[PDB]
């Protein structure tokens, strides 16, 4: 049934090291040959309330990309190469059209990451799920060379922070995006922003930074990388900060994409909250030595990325680990 | 003279393999650590009559991309990873402003392909170059693993052909272009075509398919690749074909970007000549087994490329190696 319409999208995602999948409960996959001492990096996550917006706008074609990007961008932060993906789709009444669009979006995300969709599962539970509601869980396994693991121990006083632009709100803080639409009485599809509906900017699929980061890591000495998700700047930057260091972000270095401006105005959101809930145009923050900055910026900006020097890291025993000046 | 004007755009393209400094008489570059039995692949090329068109419109900041792309696209055909680039800029009276623009375009291309601009040479020839005229020669050195070289012997019968869309005319067939512009008396800047000036369609920089192809090779079994340069389909496809083979191009699989249509109508160019002088929308053609076609097309279209099944290869002792029906 559903397996019939997704056999293709899943097979065109297969890698040379894949041996099995979708036949039983145990996908087979050999380790990439380049690794001498391979270490498996893994993580799991979901799309969040963005799923509930997708339902509202009746568009499930890009939600699968947000799913993969939330797992894959957290793996590359340690220099891991996304090997394979798996998904647990949960629903009450299985809508084939809907579930095929989501798996289709997951295939797209996997094709961009270089990893493959080797398996998954569709669980029907009429009792726990009302209406067309569904929840998708993502799983991803990546491989990294033991001696190449980025642990952030090299980060120190003097490091410059480089930022990679986002495609929009990505996949976090959509509880507040909904709350704002509700209190503002705004219809996403009717209101237009920059010659395109507000619904397009909000539903815009998360940016996958995998190939650009795997390339950057090899050509430049990277000390740490931080994926901005839940908690925004305030939560995700200290995760890569060593003891006695403060991250000073330069707010003038960039211009917030119109969606965040719209979300701040319509919601009358405060400075701190905006940097907590939304990525404000910054999806990934990289720390590297000062001499490596010019090479890093030129590499990224010449290969489909919007990169800029967003700040620096200084020695400080302040408890306020991040400062947006 | 202009060494201080471009010292920044050169240093920024530097790879970890590059040893040394200023690059004054003898560039140093170690081999990438991943190669077990490395083989050097080299090539040289110029921009062509497009230089004259870049002069008429006074646009030189992009001619450097067409220079690097010509050398760099030819290297990846055999699975070579672009390592370093060098250029030879010849002029009568060195215009520091025009020379930097061109060298900024070369650095842009080196960044996209992943190679370092490690050397250069600006020769002022007093009585050979008239006006602002200049000539640039490109030089690239790639490295491929001996056990992974793509020669084309594997190209068998039944093989499918994948085409990678071009950004326009690229960097070949511009003598005819200037003849057609001359004959029709049309000014490329005032003439509109699908939204943008005809000059924008013509001065479009060549697409650099390095990253894409290098990624395709690692995940898919590629038999051969042909870069459509001088000679177009008729000269470049046969260079990768073994004996007893014929490439059958399916003209319905794609439509020529509007530029080529305009050129054919304006010069009353015949079918065969168009395919000889111009790429007609196809920068590269790839031969691989039919089973690898779905993964290739998905991979390529998921990463910046506009790929499609353009035709097949059949066993045939015909002297007409390429057939376009």
Curated annotation (Swiss-Prot), chains A, B:
<dbReference type="InterPro" id="IPR010918">
    <property type="entry name" value="PurM-like_C_dom"/>
</dbReference>
<comment type="pathway">
    <text>Purine metabolism; IMP biosynthesis via de novo pathway; 5-amino-1-(5-phospho-D-ribosyl)imidazole from N(2)-formyl-N(1)-(5-phospho-D-ribosyl)glycinamide: step 2/2.</text>
</comment>
<keyword id="KW-0436">Ligase</keyword>
<keyword id="KW-0067">ATP-binding</keyword>
<dbReference type="Pfam" id="PF02769">
    <property type="entry name" value="AIRS_C"/>
</dbReference>
<keyword id="KW-0658">Purine biosynthesis</keyword>
<dbReference type="Pfam" id="PF00586">
    <property type="entry name" value="AIRS"/>
</dbReference>
<protein>
    <recommendedName>
        <fullName>Phosphoribosylformylglycinamidine cyclo-ligase</fullName>
        <ecNumber>6.3.3.1</ecNumber>
    </recommendedName>
</protein>
<dbReference type="GO" id="GO:0006164">
    <property type="term" value="P:purine nucleotide biosynthetic process"/>
</dbReference>
<keyword id="KW-0547">Nucleotide-binding</keyword>
<keyword id="KW-0963">Cytoplasm</keyword>
<dbReference type="InterPro" id="IPR036921">
    <property type="entry name" value="PurM-like_N_sf"/>
</dbReference>
<dbReference type="InterPro" id="IPR016188">
    <property type="entry name" value="PurM-like_N"/>
</dbReference>
<dbReference type="GO" id="GO:0046084">
    <property type="term" value="P:adenine biosynthetic process"/>
</dbReference>
<dbReference type="InterPro" id="IPR004733">
    <property type="entry name" value="PurM_cligase"/>
</dbReference>
<dbReference type="GO" id="GO:0005829">
    <property type="term" value="C:cytosol"/>
</dbReference>
<comment type="subunit">
    <text>Homodimer.</text>
</comment>
<dbReference type="GO" id="GO:0004641">
    <property type="term" value="F:phosphoribosylformylglycinamidine cyclo-ligase activity"/>
</dbReference>
<dbReference type="GO" id="GO:0004637">
    <property type="term" value="F:phosphoribosylamine-glycine ligase activity"/>
</dbReference>
<comment type="similarity">
    <text>Belongs to the AIR synthase family.</text>
</comment>
<dbReference type="GO" id="GO:0005524">
    <property type="term" value="F:ATP binding"/>
</dbReference>
<dbReference type="InterPro" id="IPR036676">
    <property type="entry name" value="PurM-like_C_sf"/>
</dbReference>
<dbReference type="GO" id="GO:0006189">
    <property type="term" value="P:'de novo' IMP biosynthetic process"/>
</dbReference>
């Amino acid at each position: 049934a559903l397996v019939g319409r997704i056999k293709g999208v899943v097979k065109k995602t297969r890698r040379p090291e894949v041996m099995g999948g979708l036949g039983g409960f145990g996908a087979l996959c050999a380790l990439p040959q380049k690794y001498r001492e391979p270490v498996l990096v893994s993580g799991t996550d979901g799309v969040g309330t963005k799923l509930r917006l997708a339902m509202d706008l009746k568009r499930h074609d890009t939600i699968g990309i947000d799913l993969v990007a939330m797992c894959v961008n957290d793996l590359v932060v340690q220099g891991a190469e996304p090997l394979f993906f798996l998904d647990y789709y949960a629903t009450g009444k299985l809508d084939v059209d809907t579930a095929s669009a989501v798996i289709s979006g997951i295939a797209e995300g996997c094709l961009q990451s270089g990893c493959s969709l080797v398996g998954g599962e569709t669980a029907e539970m009429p009792g726990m799920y009302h209406g067309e509601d569904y929840d998708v869980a993502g799983f991803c396994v990546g491989v990294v060379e033991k001696s190449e693991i980025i642990d952030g121990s090299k980060v120190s006083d003097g490091d410059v922070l480089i930022a990679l632009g986002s495609s929009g709100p990505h996949s976090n803080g959509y509880s507040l995006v909904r709350k704002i639409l509700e209190v503002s009485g705004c219809d996403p599809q009717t209101t237009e922003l920059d010659g395109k509906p507000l619904a397009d900017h909000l539903l815009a699929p998360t940016r996958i930074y995998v190939k650009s980061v795997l390339e950057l890591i090899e050509k430049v000495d990277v000390h740490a990388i931080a994926h901005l998700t839940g908690g925004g700047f305030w939560e995700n930057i200290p995760r890569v900060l060593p003891d006695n260091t403060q991250a000073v972000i330069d707010e003038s270095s960039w211009q917030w994409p119109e969606v965040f401006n719209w979300l701040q105005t319509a919601g009358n959101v405060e400075h701190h909250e905006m940097y907590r809930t939304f990525n404000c145009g910054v999806g990934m923050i990289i720390a590297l030595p000062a001499p490596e900055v010019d090479k890093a910026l030129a590499l990224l900006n010449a290969n489909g990325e919007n990169a800029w020097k967003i700040g620096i890291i200084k020695a400080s025993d302040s408890e306020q680990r991040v400062v947006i000046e």
